[PDB]
């Protein structure tokens, strides 16, 4: 049994995400698959199950017409359609493995959860991808780094030296600005000799926008 | 009906523990309860299902049981290598759905502070070419965690939108944190000392570094 | 207290090169230097304000700067869109006036 599926990619609120995993090593006309979110703080939620066999797919009382679920029998990949994703969405998205059978509202307490694998994640979004902005940072043992910011969506990769210093490198965790915007914090350590004389440059690849921006630190004048 | 369950649980490695998780009539007894456990970074992975069987795959180390209103999970023993948050799952007639329990940490049970450590990274030139000043100070090499960072100018606290980052864990046994600060350059210029504290639950460093160089 | 700025600059496409823009005592140092431009019949734009901030819909090639009596304009590359003739432009207190040099002409070599 396997999961292996690729990452949603950030939609706006008011629009459509896609999330489908890949069903192999057996037949997909038995197994009803269930679509959950892992909601960070709090418990899971459900909406529906999915029959591959028959039209005979239901909804929940709390999801009425968030959800729309279409079937597919010669990829034999359940397809998702959401519509007016909220604040509420940000939660990654897998897809629960099920096994056997039910139709009727009395054979649902037999089942359990069978397979979680490579979920993907969904969540409603303001800020979306834009083109960083990024300038070098001043430093104050000594301490230096750079900042990132004007950047969506999480995470970046900052790397020192063309990456060829790793010890010391922590990606600091970003916070939830009201902007929509983030801030991924990268320091390293230096002795107090060397502040101003040896150049250190650190490297951010920014995947959906394809830029790759080299800044040189330096002290403030 | 909401399953609600212990945010949080204290356990000394070496001996068991259980989690109990308060139903009503309808969801525990009557339907069966499942438990869901996640690791951190990975793919959850049922537990027990059914209350009496185990699924293939674990060694006969865990159980699970019902009880009336409450369903038990008893853990014998704990390894510190493994914590992993345990979910509770049942069934209702009257929501006719899955419902689901909030999650319960597990810790094992002391060791004495450290001295941490906090720099200021005022921005250079280029930051404030672009008509903005932002502010961050970062904390490392404490341990444990729970650290709020406010700022303060050496006269009067300013709350233009502060914000604190939740405390992350690194490799090399110790927590760290950092804080954000975005203002402009007409107020930037106004004082000419900024610095920001950290509570340590007993420590406090002010680290004081002019905006010069 | 009158500006004084070159009539013609020399400058090679493909490094960088600068200018410098003096002028009197009391004109200079007390008051900052504003770089601007204009396009041969059309209205004049702003190309630089205060020496420390880059204005928004000017593409960030001139570098704002002033070191002393005498004023550095410093640029990063050329290029033949780029052609547009730069002044240089100062308040002077005892003046009561923006003072205006000869302006620069600027041709590739």
């Known amino acids: 049994v396997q999961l292996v599926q690729s990452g949603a990619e950030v939609k706006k609120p008011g629009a459509s995400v896609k999330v489908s995993c890949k069903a192999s090593?057996?037949?997909?006309?038995?197994?009803?698959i269930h679509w959950v979110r892992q909601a960070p703080g709090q418990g899971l939620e459900w909406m529906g199950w999915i029959s591959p066999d028959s039209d005979d797919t239901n909804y929940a009382q709390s999801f009425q017409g968030r959800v729309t679920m279409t079937r597919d029998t010669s990829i034999t990949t359940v397809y998702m359609e959401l519509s007016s994703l909220r604040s509420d969405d940000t939660a990654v998205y897998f897809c629960?493995?099920?096994?056997?059978?039910?139709?009727?509202?009395?054979?649902?307490?037999?089942?359990?959860?069978?397979?979680w694998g490579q979920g993907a994640l969904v969540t409603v979004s303001s800020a979306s991808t834009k083109g960083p902005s990024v300038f070098p940072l001043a430093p104050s043992t000594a301490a230096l780094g750079c900042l990132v910011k004007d950047y969506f969506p999480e995470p970046v990769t900052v790397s020192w030296n063309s990456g060829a210093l790793t010890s010391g490198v922590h990606t600091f965790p970003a916070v939830l600005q009201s902007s929509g915007l983030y801030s991924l914090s990268s320091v390293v350590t230096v002795p107090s000799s060397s502040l101003g004389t040896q150049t250190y440059i650190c490297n951010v690849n920014h995947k959906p926008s394809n830029t790759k921006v080299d800044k040189k630190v330096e002290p403030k004048s | 009906p909401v399953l609600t369950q212990p945010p949080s649980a204290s356990g000394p490695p070496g001996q068991s523990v259980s989690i109990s998780c308060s139903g009503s009539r309808s969801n525990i007894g009557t339907n069966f309860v499942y438990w869901y456990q996640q690791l951190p970074g990975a793919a959850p992975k049922l537990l027990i299902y059914?209350?009496?069987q185990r699924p293939s795959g674990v060694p006969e180390r865990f159980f699970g049981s019902k009880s009336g209103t409450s369903a038990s999970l008893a853990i014998s023993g704990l390894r510190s290598e493994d914590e992993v948050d345990y979910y509770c799952?049942?069934?209702?007639?009257?929501?006719?759905?899955?419902?689901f329990g909030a999650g319960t940490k597990v810790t094992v049970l002391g060791q004495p502070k450290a001295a941490p450590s906090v720099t200021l990274f005022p921005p250079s030139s280029e930051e404030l070419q672009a008509n903005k000043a932002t502010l961050v100070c970062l904390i490392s090499d404490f341990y444990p965690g729970a650290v709020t960072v406010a700022w303060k100018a050496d006269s009067s606290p300013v709350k233009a939108g502060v914000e604190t980052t939740t405390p992350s864990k690194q490799s090399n046994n110790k927590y760290a944190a950092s804080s954000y600060l975005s203002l402009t350059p007409e107020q930037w210029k106004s004082h000419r000392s900024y610095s920001c504290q950290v509570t340590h639950e007993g420590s406090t460093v002010e680290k004081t570094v002019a905006p010069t160089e | 207290p009158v500006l004084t700025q070159p009539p013609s600059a020399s400058g090679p496409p493909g490094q960088s090169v600068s200018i410098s823009c003096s002028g009197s005592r009391s004109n200079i140092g007390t008051n900052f230097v504003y770089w601007y431009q204009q396009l041969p019949g059309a209205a004049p734009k702003l190309?630089?304000?205060?020496?420390?901030?880059?204005?928004s819909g000017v593409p960030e090639r001139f570098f704002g700067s002033k070191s002393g009596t005498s004023a550095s304009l410093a640029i990063s590359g050329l290029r033949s869109e780029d052609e547009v003739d730069?002044?240089?432009?100062?308040?002077?207190?005892?003046?009561?006036?923006?003072?205006?040099?000869?302006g620069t002409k600027v041709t590739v070599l």
């Open positions: 799952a049942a069934w209702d007639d009257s929501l006719s759905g899955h419902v």
């Open positions: 059914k209350n009496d």
């Open positions: 090593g057996y037949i997909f006309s038995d197994y009803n």
């Open positions: 629960a493995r099920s096994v056997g059978y039910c139709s009727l509202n009395s054979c649902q307490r037999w089942m359990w959860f069978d397979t």
